Structures are given as C-alpha cells and as structure tokens.
Write a protein that binds this DNA or RNA. Structure first.
Ligand code: NA
Ligand code: NA
Length: 327
DNA sequence: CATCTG
DNA sequence: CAGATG
C-alpha cells in the first residue's frame, strides 16, 4: 500500500502505455498482474531478483525494478514522457468518444490538439463531436448542491409522466459524496420485467420529457434501454449559466431493481465485501440477482427482493444506509 | 454490456 | 458484421 508503491506505479504507467500507444495488450496485460501481485506483497522489495521470485514477475520486469530501484528513474519511462506521440494519444483520448484506437488514427493524420480537432470536426462523429464541444464542462466535477437540483428535476418529470415510475440516482451521490462525476439514474416500472416482453416507450417517454423542458440537451446514444446523454441546469437569472452535464438513464425490469440499485451504489469495496459475505451466508449476488447457492458446486434460482433491505436480509446482514456503504 | 459506425 | 467506446 506504500511499501512498494513507485514500483507498482511504474508498472502502471508502463502497462498503460502499452495498451494506449503500442498495441501490446499482451505486455499491457502483463504489467498489470504484475503491479497487482507486488501490491499485495508484504515486504520491501529490495531488488529485482526479489520480485522475479514472484509470479507474473518475469526477467524483464525485474529489469525494470532493478533500474528504478537503482535510480529514481526509468529510462524507458522517461523517454516515453517526452515523446510527443505518446502524449497526443494519452491526451485526445480525454475526449468523449475518442478512444485509443482513434487516438492513433488522428495523430497519425496529425491531429494532436484541441484546435486540430475543431479544424477537422468533420473527421469526428456525433459523440466525438459533442465530446469535443463540452470538453471543458465534461472535465468539471459535479458539486452536490447542483446534483440535488438535477435530481429534483429528474424525479419531478418522471413522476409526472407516470406515477408508476421509480427512479433512483445512484453513485457516490447516493453514497453521500460532496461531488460527482456524472448523473447516473436507475430506471424501472411495474409494467416491466424479466419475462415481460419489452416496452421501449418505457424509456423513451421520459427522455422526451427531460428534453421537453430542456433538461437534457443532447443524445450520446439513445438505445432501447440505455440512453447516454447531456443535460443542463437552467440558467436562472442570466449571468451564471451552468456547465453541460453527462447524464445516463437506464431501464430496468422491476423484478431487478434493488439488485442493481445496490450494486451501482458501491462502493466497489463494499460490493465485494458484501458479495463475499453473501457467499458465506449460502448465496451469490451480481448486478441483477441474488440466488440460493447449492452444494454440488453451484446452483441458482433468483430469490425475490422488494428493496435493498430484502437483500441484506437474505445474507443476514446489517442494513446499511447508503452512506456507510463505503467499504 | 449495449450502442454506434461504416 | 467486427470493432470501438463508455
Ligand atoms: Na514468476
Ligand atoms: Na475518450
């Protein structure tokens, strides 16, 4: 956790590069387990020879540990840091919709900057185009105070559309966090579930509302159960307009709500711990369900849950307010 | 994973 | 359809 940090950290830049610049999924995948194991490793790795010992830890890595151990630097790392090429990728990649794959192509066409992009908006797609157009805003963290305002909006319009809707705004927001990245809303309806063969209007209808009243400004991808978008807090009495926000709405069959609701809410650490416990308590949990685990090795059959409470119950645990869901 | 592109 | 992105 701090005893072998830089090591795990160099590994990480190394790995990241591989997969972002080079295409070395192979190698890339390698730095990773690597970082992962040294990470759990309980001692002060004094040498490469010491790491090699570890599994995942090959001769090359040990090569890299020794040098970095030997000098507070890595040549490769250092050479990688300057390299304009590697920089452009790692950069453009910051635009929504611009991945690495596209990172390469653009650079390879000589687009390597914000301006580059604008100049060539044509080579970008709707998503990439919005991505670039709200470059800044998208980079901006979300203050709780805004979050509550938005939530108030989402919930009011959904209500309006059907008293039967059940929205939940998950994430750290839910966990209490002072700020957030993006607005994540979990959506269901009675009239929608497991067997219940579709009803796409279920998701559409709302999208429209939020768009009616101008909350949602753009579509990233609107599918039949997942809409990826952009929303905005109405600018009050003009002088202070809000930033443009990344909002994501997803339809869920009522018979599956709280499982997800739990889940999306995190934290990741909480999930695992909660997941492992389930397992003890004779069960299994995942994003959609919680099932009675048999002895033969495995077994299923989705237990029926009416709230986040039913779940906890199942695994015989302390109902935890979203707050303490930390770890 | 579900949507998108081309 | 493969392949990318989030
Ligand atoms: Na090894
Ligand atoms: Na991106």
């Amino acid at each position: 956790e701090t005893l072998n940090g830089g090591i795990t950290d160099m590994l990480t830049e190394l790995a990241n590069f591989e997969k972002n610049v080079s295409q070395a999924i192979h190698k890339y995948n390698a730095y990773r387990k690597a970082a992962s194991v040294i990470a759990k490793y309980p001692h002060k790795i004094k040498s490469g020879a010491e790491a090699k010992k570890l599994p995942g830890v090959g001769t090359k890595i040990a090569e890299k540990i020794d040098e970095f151990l030997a000098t507070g630097k890595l040549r490769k790392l250092e050479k990688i840091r300057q390299d304009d090429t590697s920089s452009s990728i790692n950069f453009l990649t910051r635009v929504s919709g611009i991945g690495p794959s596209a990172a390469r192509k653009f650079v390879d066409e000589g687009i390597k900057t914000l301006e580059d992009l604008r100049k060539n908006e044509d080579k970008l797609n709707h998503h990439q185009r919005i991505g670039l157009k709200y470059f800044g805003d998208f980079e901006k963290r979300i203050p709780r105070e805004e979050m509550l305002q938005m939530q108030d909006i989402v919930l009011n319009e959904v209500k309006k559309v059907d008293s039967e809707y059940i929205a939940t705004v998950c994430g750290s927001f839910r966990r209490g966090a002072e700020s957030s990245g993006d607005m994540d809303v979990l959506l269901t309806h009675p009239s929608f579930t497991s067997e219940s063969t579709k009803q796409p209007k279920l998701l559409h209808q709302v999208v429209e509302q939020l768009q009616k009243v101008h909350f949602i400004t753009d579509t990233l991808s609107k599918g039949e159960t997942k809409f990826m978008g952009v929303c905005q807090l109405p600018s009050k009495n003009d002088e202070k307009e809000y930033p443009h926000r990344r909002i994501d709405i997803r339809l869920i069959p009522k018979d599956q709500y709280y499982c997800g609701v739990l889940y999306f809410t995190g934290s990741d650490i909480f999930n695992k711990n909660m997941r492992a416990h389930a397992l003890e308590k004779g069960f299994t949990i995942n994003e959609y369900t919680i099932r009675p685990l048999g002895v033969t090795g495995v077994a299923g059959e989705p237990l029926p849950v009416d709230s986040e409470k039913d779940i906890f119950d199942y695994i015989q645990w302390k109902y935890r307010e979203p707050k303490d869901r930390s770890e």
